[PDB]
Design a protein around this ligand. Sequence first.
Ligand SMILES: [K+]
Ligand SMILES: [K+]
Ligand SMILES: [Mg+2]
Ligand SMILES: [Mg+2]
Ligand SMILES: [Mg+2]
Ligand SMILES: [Mg+2]
Ligand SMILES: [Mg+2]
Ligand SMILES: [Mg+2]
Ligand SMILES: [Mg+2]
Ligand SMILES: [Mg+2]
Ligand SMILES: [Mg+2]
Lengths: 159, 96, 57, 153
Amino acid sequence: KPGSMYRNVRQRSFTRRKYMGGVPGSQVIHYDMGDKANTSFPVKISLIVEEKCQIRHTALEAARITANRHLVADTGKMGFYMKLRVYPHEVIRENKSGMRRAFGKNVGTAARVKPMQKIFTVAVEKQNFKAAKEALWHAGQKLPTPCRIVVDEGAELVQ
Amino acid sequence: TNSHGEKRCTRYKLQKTVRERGISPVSRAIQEFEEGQMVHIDIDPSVQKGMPNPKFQGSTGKVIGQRGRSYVLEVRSGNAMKEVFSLPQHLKPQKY
Amino acid sequence: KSFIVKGKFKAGSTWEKFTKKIESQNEKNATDKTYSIFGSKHGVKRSQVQIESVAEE
Amino acid sequence: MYAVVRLRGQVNVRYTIEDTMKMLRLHKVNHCVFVPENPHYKGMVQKVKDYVAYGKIDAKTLAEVLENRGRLEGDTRLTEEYIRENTDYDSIQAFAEAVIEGKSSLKDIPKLKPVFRLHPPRKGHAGIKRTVQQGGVLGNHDENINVLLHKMR
RNA sequence: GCAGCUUGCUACCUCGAUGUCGGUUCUUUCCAUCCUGGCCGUGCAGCAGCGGCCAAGGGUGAGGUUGUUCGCCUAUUAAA
RNA sequence: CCUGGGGCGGGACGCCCUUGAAAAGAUAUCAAGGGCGCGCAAUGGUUGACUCAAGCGGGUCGGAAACUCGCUGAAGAGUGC
RNA sequence: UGGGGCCCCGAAAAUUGACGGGGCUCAAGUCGACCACCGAUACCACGGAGUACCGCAAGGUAAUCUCGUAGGAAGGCGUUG
RNA sequence: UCCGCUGGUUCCUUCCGAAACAUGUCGCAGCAUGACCUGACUUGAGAUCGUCGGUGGAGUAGAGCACUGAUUGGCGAUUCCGGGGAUCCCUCGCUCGCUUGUCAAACUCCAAACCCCCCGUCAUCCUAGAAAGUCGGAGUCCGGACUGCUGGGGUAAGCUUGUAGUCCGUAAGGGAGACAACCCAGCCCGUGGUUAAGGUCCCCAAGUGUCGACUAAGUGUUAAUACUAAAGGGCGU
RNA sequence: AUCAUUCGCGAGGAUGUAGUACGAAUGUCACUGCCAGUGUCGUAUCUUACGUUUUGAAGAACGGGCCAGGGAGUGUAUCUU
Ligand SMILES: [K+]
Ligand SMILES: [K+]
Ligand SMILES: [Mg+2]
Ligand SMILES: [Mg+2]
Ligand SMILES: [Mg+2]
Ligand SMILES: [Mg+2]
Ligand SMILES: [Mg+2]
Ligand SMILES: [Mg+2]
Ligand SMILES: [Mg+2]
Ligand SMILES: [Mg+2]
Ligand SMILES: [Mg+2]
């Protein structure tokens, strides 16, 4: 089931789970990676999507896995802090007959993100800026939107 | 399916603001209007008697008489003139 | 006949300063050529180019 | 004094904008009216900004429009002799200067029509799919309405 | 993402009828190439493979079951 | 009869509420959440007197499960469905 | 290193075919601007017809009259007696 | 015979000109009533399609977490309710707060722009008859499209079902190659002129127009468009 | 138009010449023996028949080979206007 199905935003939100029934649980396990009790990381880069889209929980999990693997391999187990900012709140549904009673059944969850919205933020030391940049580039390849990396803190510390 | 009651789609029309819930100011219940005066219809949800239809909420009526405690108003609804009965708790003078 | 034109133009999502050096007949021709150059090089209309100043070099 | 010239026609226009046009007496393209500067007329002109060109008119342009396109009941052409018979002003230039100064009114010409049916603009106009601020002809010309009025004589 | 060659969805055309499936015959086209031609890589010694690129000029058959399409099987075959 | 043909399924075939519905009103679908075809001589009327939920502290095998005291508490209760 | 314009790769379909065609490369493409012209039954002018309303009539007014399916209304043409 | 179903129904001009919608219906290819068209009469002074200002209605967009529910860690505590192998000898998940990160058709401490009622104002119409009323004749209740509303549903659909405006239907003429509904434009007849949209290398009326750049791919030479290929990449420029 | 001056980087613009010469037409004076009309063909522009069913008809939707003639709102009763 391709991500192009539940990708475009054409509809209102579908998030009130007390008026629906049976939502499959999200695949994304953690939302904070690296060293969670460190705040004195001078450089902080984030990945912002540049289109209004819906990101499925499986896409978020895939991007998170790839970025976390790259960061752990390059900077080490606690050489970085990584935050997945958005939670999949939207419930995705599918119509599984034809068009009669076509209101779908819940098949997953997605995060409805806006243009220029931060998806992932990574904090590292000065020497790991390019590694964090590379990891976030790999993470954005798993997402259904074009992305761009921005430096939030420590711009003068990289160039 | 969808009903046809008077209280249809009245969730926010017949709701009170947070800090005006409770006993309303009692001055609004003892106001007198002259014949031909223009009054607004702003329904008080806590006063459940003498309440016009919510369809006339937000309309200005002209007082054309009195029927006890309530006032008879000529209220324009689309292109018709409706006779609406209202207690003064739901009414309010227009200010010029 | 070489001028110095300063200002900012909208490059996609971010505004950008510039201090372009321009050769033209006069000051207003230099302003016109600045507008034309940025329209050609970046596809921006003249409302999206703000020329702060033009100074004879 | 506003100069209001209609430049877009009546097909596919909302009834509210078209009714505003009718209340301004602008039923056809190239027709022009002159209205005062009060906020009522300002809002009415703002309502129809996408179908008219407007601006502040000067006395010379008003004089030329009156001489070339002023009409009386029965479709008679306004002249200087009628102006001197029915007004205290010698000529049409003085009357137009008075009207611009606000000390006289176009209703002070008996049987004069409030609509000036103008010629199409010589050498064309800037285009009716863009506003004045976009390089077109629609909307507020300010004092530059007289350029367009001069080319529609 | 492509195609529209599977099946769906849909109800725009056709109900004063556009004759169904499969095969057969004959002609043609596509290329996403099975063989034949030319190449590149190889965990390519040779033989022979595997993977990929160009290329649609020619070829791509005979049989057993089954109406079959599809598929299975047989013996040839450069490939069938 | 409705019906993304018909049929099978279902009833969106009577009534009531929320959303859809785009801050007047109106607004469709086999749209979403649903509910009703009742119950009650008290579970009704009025007057008087009181104030609820839940926490915190005190009180004896009356256990951190009873009852009672104090404090907080515009309601987080109750008001038949 | 970041942000931008245009282009390239990604990019495979069935009769021979589609920027409308020819063709076009400091353009006959794209972008930012500009100049002149062509081009309606639109608009302007003249002349004419009808219509609406008014007027005893003569006539007056029409920027605010002149498209039209279902359909209503009015006045005429023709056939036979 | 009957049919709500199919086909046909014969002269001209002139004036005006819809509805493809609601409620009820063994109603769903029908009909009634109403909206909408048309004709006549009565009545006799106002009306409101538009503006501006004001008195009022807001609970949508957006925003936000203060309620209802969701939601991510960090930090501090509940010596409370409980997961792990006789002094419950000591390990601790939820729960409650202070900071962090996210949300909502059916959440709201907030909160527009449109819009609606009323008052005043200008504007327009109106004694050549406003608003109102009465009566005659209907058609119509298969619609469709474009532009918005992220409209709802749907993987999507030249899909389906809403809504506002405007069109085609019933709309010529001019222009887009052709084009129901896209642009100009609503159109009595004739002539002259000037423009609109759109175009000006030839086909084809008017530029082998001007200035400043870009493109090397015949890319492109495609307003809207059901008629136009993406993610990703490029020390191409 | 042409020319003069001036502005503009340029294509060009403005001012004067010039509201002039011209100009639909309306009169008038000469000249002329055709013109109107009709048939056919050519050049230019425009238009894919007609009636119907249709949201949409040139349709690959229905109808007609052609021509002539015939071929469809009538009467009684009653109600309303
Ligand atoms: K179907
Ligand atoms: K909250
Ligand atoms: Mg049925
Ligand atoms: Mg008719
Ligand atoms: Mg009918
Ligand atoms: Mg919102
Ligand atoms: Mg339109
Ligand atoms: Mg029809
Ligand atoms: Mg129409
Ligand atoms: Mg046309
Ligand atoms: Mg006959």
